[PDB]
Symmetry: C3
Subunit: 486 residues, 3 copies
């Protein structure tokens, strides 16, 4: 007798997916949604190299610590890289006021131009510009000083009241940095500045601060009992800044005209720079991927997959792999799949006097391929790209804000890890049920064509009561079986 | 010859919904969950108009910038509106310390009583109350000053140490504002206050601050090289505030007894006030809606739909529209729907010698389930109540960016939640109808058994004569099979 | 003469909800929401909390004389303030960065209180004896903090003092001090002689100078003076130098800190008991393995996730129908069998001479067990929540913190409730599908050899004994014999 059987695809795949109902289900086709590979290097971003501070931190760079001269030509960058445990910062000990806020400002700067805000040789005619070096800021085995600040002291035995103004005609914000020095004794105050009770005043149209030396016994920091506090402000285009002092001013020498940009950040990384280009950079390495998720690093620059805690995110696209359910066909009354059917997901096996063969049902297969492809793309589309994450740093009196920031990051990460894993589990179950349903619907369509002209053999097969040649088989496969003829 | 067919509804609906598997599925019935329409106007909230500061900001209002006099009678409001056109704040240049914190405080204030904390004519017998006007704060082309502060100066080249106390007897918090003036020269310091080295002290039971004038050369802001810094504190009921000064005090004259309320806020909007009432206000306009979501504005006042970024949220309630699946019936062996069946979702078409009719039982059970599902989804989407604005000064960029990460993160999640739930439930709803049609076909097929031929297209060809009385029996579920096995 | 396929029923009154239906009575279900606690404060992993009682953190660390019972405190698992702690900074003034100090103590597992500047010998040129006050009274006498020392002039001299402490404790040392602000210049001279005094406090990373601000002030607890309190964490090996010409309320005792994990500060009016717990809330301890709880958002230890839900119940069994998407349950098989006590799906036979289908039932049990376990696994336990407090000039931060907490709580309450509703619908459909598949297997195995009644039963044309009935149940039915 001649027979036609309805069955489904199988292959040599060893891909496994999970559902809520079952773990480690081997499937014929699947897609990985989780990027876990990077190149372990620092790369250019959209063709623009980062700024590598190397042995310096942000403080050492912007103040011009003399160990940081290699950073002086710095113009434009795609992101800024601090290395772990930068050893060159504010060499002369003291407090850098609103330092974290300054770093947050630099996080949106794409370029700056360093310029001589107060030319050293001409700006300070009544004061000494030459004696301001210190062993606290040594370089090349000699006492030195910041490149961007100027330690003014008395000339002869006079420190007259100074007043210096700068008008911002750069057409951009100007970052102005200065310092206030705090001697360790009144005699030192007089030796450096003559005036016993001095002050510094710095005023713009939106900045206004006055500083008084606070002289006291202090522990030595790198053998220095003095202190030098550092301050900064953003001078708006067209605005004027006025410095007034009777002592203790560490005057601006160079300042920075800032250009604002999009998508920059400051990261800490021990990775090395290479001649690579990427659209996505993390502190551990660059990512070249189109997947929706990644488990490499929560800190990203550019356009990156969303970070999740997951170790596996795999969506099934094909069928259970059974090479010899909710709808009962796959792994049900059709107990196994057909490795012999290599051209579709669902199809037919026939056996007549002319021979036998496998043929996939193109219509049901292509409709299932279209649905599953839309499902995967729809899932990916809902997982919007992760753009440059903004670093957040807090000082030792901002622990509450630090913990709040951590709670926010941790909470969002919890939710997206849960969303990603759960959606994949649910959709994997639905995808397997979808295939089971398609096999079931295909079987029932063939059963409705043949009616009493064949007996059901139980395994998805029909044993014809007449002879069914290759032309007759094709009629069943394309759905035009002429029942009255037999 | 006589036939009865099982089928499903179709109509002229052009509504489309999406699923994970398919996009733009035309369906017979659906509900929009996303509000995108507003009236473009500012309205009253629960019958109470907002406070429109107009050309003034909060500082100009509370300090009493003379250009803001129309705001002085202000008593109660439902929300506060700043416009992008704020030209009137602190007319005399200076810093307003903790301004953002003050605005945050005002956001929960439903009414204030402006009152004379230190009557000008009696509080300061030893100082000059008349010389304290300035071109920086003009009104009507004449030099003036804040309506709520008093610029005390020396009288007869003397400025004695002043000490003035006020006991809060209002039974509410009292907001007290004052200023400290910083001359641009010692000559000016002496011309105004005589004393070269003055101070201001302001102390309550929980506030304690001392101010020293800082004289220096400064750039002119609005033709003024001096500065005046503004300060405020909340004086608890029963507490006393004591002002002590030897110069430079811009003294409180009027203060504010504050009443706390719920659901108020401060917004920035250039929309206009109209004679309308709403339960939900945004800066772009008021919303009149019961839908769970809206894409009009993240800033809301009152009881509002949840803001999402989505541009379409549509839940299918009916069936795919097929006018002349997981279970194989709809778009399956029953290849199409019936536009002729206008009274239900699933039913029967007959053709005897003597017509569409809906099956009330299967249709009404599906109606209840779909109605329960949509309501359950909507109930899970809790209403959005008044959002609190967040403003930060130029040394709070980190906190500003944290607030933005918080707002963006929640917005991402709810947009994802809303869109995904609709896609998932749309697919299950379509499959639900497919199951229902399938189950009804099998029920009728189980009633008819061998008394009819199964045509395969959802139709049964009767082997006996089936009149309108026989057809009704099939729909009823009361088909008498043995009675017609003998009528072949 | 008959073989029937059917499903389990029992006397369970449990109800679950789906998106489609409310209050569906089901045969088996599992509560995921913990709502019971013991109403007591307990030990955490064997270690008792620090009960501040009538004192707040300030009164404890300053050594408010009403807080003497707290002086030997060494180690604890968490810290408990009670509502309306009436003993704090007895002498009125500002405690600078108080909330930050509390945040620091939230990760402290133990401290060692020690005499940083021995009273009788550290201040040879100043008076250590006159520093008591009615603001800090104890036992009906004027008194003072136990951890600070109110230095004053000796005779009529208050020379410049300089005192240093080197931190040799191998741990961070918490140092506290105060600055006194008299109400008049005469009081300044009576106490400290010097009219214009200052205090300086400097370590390697702290540097602050303080000037007395003398002014008319309202009396707080009959005291018009003020005393402001300051603190710093002195790193191991670092030195702190105090320098003063008056007004210094000197450190007397300081605290060597040991850092720990999972501690916190809570406010609770519950009482301590001789109980041990892995999860503590301010309302009581929790003894539970459930993923969610609605008792309190503030937790210590390893706790179920807090949600606002009032019911979270997952159906595991079937709809209970005693005497659907796939059409079997509550469909052509109109009801369940209370007689079938050994499985979810099975058969009832009736020959001349109940049994559950073990294979489908056990496959259903494994699937449902995996689904419930997978749900709980995705709901990560809630670890110790870190309290957040803000001063009266930090209202924006307080509201931002509240937006975060409320925002996360909304999302987790939504996620938990929705997942349960969705999976409840899928579980019922799962059982419906299984019964249908079992019915379809029996109908295809016995083929035309039995009458198909319509209630899931088949009427045999032949005699089918206990050996034959087992053939149908075992899937080994020999159709050719009939
Ligand atoms: C589901 O069952 C619960 C419990 O029987 C119902 O809750 C009752 O709701 C009414 C509302 O007016 C209250 O008066 C009762 O006190 C509630 N009972 C309990 C025990 O809380 C609920 O209404 C039912 N829901 C539906 C849709 O039928
Ligand atoms: C798996 O099957 C594919 C397709 O038949 C073949 O190309 C590949 O070599 C096979 N690999 C193994 C390991 O069997
Ligand atoms: C680089 O930094 C990472 C992150 O802290 C760290 O785990 C890793 O050990 C570092 N590598 C080296 C060589 O220090
Ligand atoms: C990423 O990998 C693909 C794989 O072919 C390659 O075409 C592409 O150039 C890669 N991108 C980068 C930036 O190297
Ligand atoms: C369908 O099968 C019949 C039978 O062989 C054949 O004649 C006809 O051309 C087929 N049509 C298509 C579109 O394959
Ligand atoms: C459908 O028909 C009704 C009745 O004529 C009409 O009001 C409605 O606009 C029609 N819809 C479309 C899309 O044509
Ligand atoms: C759906 O229809 C709209 C309008 O006809 C069209 O713009 C859109 O591209 C279609 N497809 C999707 C996926 O929205
Ligand atoms: C304010 O007006 C400008 C242009 O006049 C417009 O672009 C902006 O959207 C308006 N703001 C609001 C909140 O409607
Ligand atoms: C708001 O919508 C309702 C819809 O029922 C409508 O009746 C009402 O006229 C609309 N306007 C107001 C002000 O309620
Ligand atoms: C409910 O039925 C079970 C099954 O036998 C029985 O063990 C239990 O005692 C019954 N409980 C009640 C309250 O009827
Ligand atoms: C604890 O405080 C709550 C606050 O509402 C109160 O309801 C409860 O009675 C208090 N318990 C005790 C034991 O004081
Ligand atoms: C905690 O509950 C379990 C049962 O849920 C019980 O066996 C155990 O004894 C309980 N422990 C305590 C300390 O109450």
């Amino acid at each position: 007798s001649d027979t036609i059987c309805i069955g489904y695809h199988a292959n040599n795949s060893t891909d496994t997916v999970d559902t809520l109902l079952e773990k480690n289900v081997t499937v014929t086709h699947s897609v990985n949604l989780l990027e876990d590979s990077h190149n372990g290097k620092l790369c250019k971003l959209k063709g623009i190299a980062p700024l590598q501070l190397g042995k310096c931190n942000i403080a050492g760079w912007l103040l011009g610590n003399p160990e940081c001269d290699s950073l002086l030509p710095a113009r434009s960058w795609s992101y800024i890289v601090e290395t772990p445990n930068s050893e060159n910062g504010a060499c002369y000990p003291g407090d850098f006021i609103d330092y974290e806020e300054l770093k947050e400002q630099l996080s949106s700067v794409s370029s700056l131009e360093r310029f001589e805000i107060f030319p050293k040789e001409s700006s300070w005619p009544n004061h000494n510009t030459l004696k301001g070096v210190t062993a606290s800021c040594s370089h090349g085995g000699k006492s030195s000083f910041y490149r961007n600040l100027l330690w003014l002291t008395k000339t002869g035995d006079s420190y007259p009241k100074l007043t210096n103004s700068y008008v911002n005609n750069k057409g951009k914000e100007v970052l102005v940095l200065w310092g206030v020095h705090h001697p360790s004794s009144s005699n030192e105050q007089q030796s450096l500045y003559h005036n016993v009770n001095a002050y510094v005043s710095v005023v713009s149209s939106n900045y206004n601060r006055r500083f008084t030396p606070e002289i006291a016994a202090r522990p030595k920091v790198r053998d220095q009992p003095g202190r030098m506090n550092y301050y900064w402000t953003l001078l708006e285009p067209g605005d004027t800044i006025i410095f007034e002092a009777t002592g203790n001013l560490i005057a601006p020498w160079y300042a920075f005209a800032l250009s604002r940009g999009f998508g920059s950040s400051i990261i800490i990384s021990n990775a090395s720079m290479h001649e690579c280009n990427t659209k996505c950079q993390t502190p551990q390495g660059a990512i070249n991927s189109s997947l929706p998720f990644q488990n490499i690093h929560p800190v990203t620059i550019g356009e990156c997959p969303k970070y999740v805690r997951s170790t596996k995110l795999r969506m099934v696209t094909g069928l259970r792999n059974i090479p010899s359910g909710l709808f009962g066909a796959i792994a049900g009354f059709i107990e196994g799949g057909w490795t012999g059917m290599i051209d579709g997901w669902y199809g037919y096996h026939h056996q007549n006097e002319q021979g036998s063969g496998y043929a996939a049902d193109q219509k049901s297969t292509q409709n299932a391929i279209n649905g599953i492809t839309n499902k995967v793309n729809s899932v990916i589309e809902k997982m919007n790209t992760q753009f440059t994450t903004v670093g957040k740093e807090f000082n030792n009196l901002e622990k509450r804000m630090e913990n709040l920031n951590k709670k926010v990051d941790d909470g969002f990460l919890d939710i997206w890890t849960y969303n990603a894993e759960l959606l994949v589990l649910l959709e994997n179950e639905r995808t397997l049920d979808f295939h089971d349903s398609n096999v079931k619907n295909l079987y029932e369509k063939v059963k409705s064509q043949l009616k009493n002209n064949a007996k059901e053999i139980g395994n998805g097969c029909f044993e014809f009561y007449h002879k069914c040649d290759n032309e007759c088989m094709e009629s069943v496969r394309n759905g035009t079986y002429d029942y009255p003829k037999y």
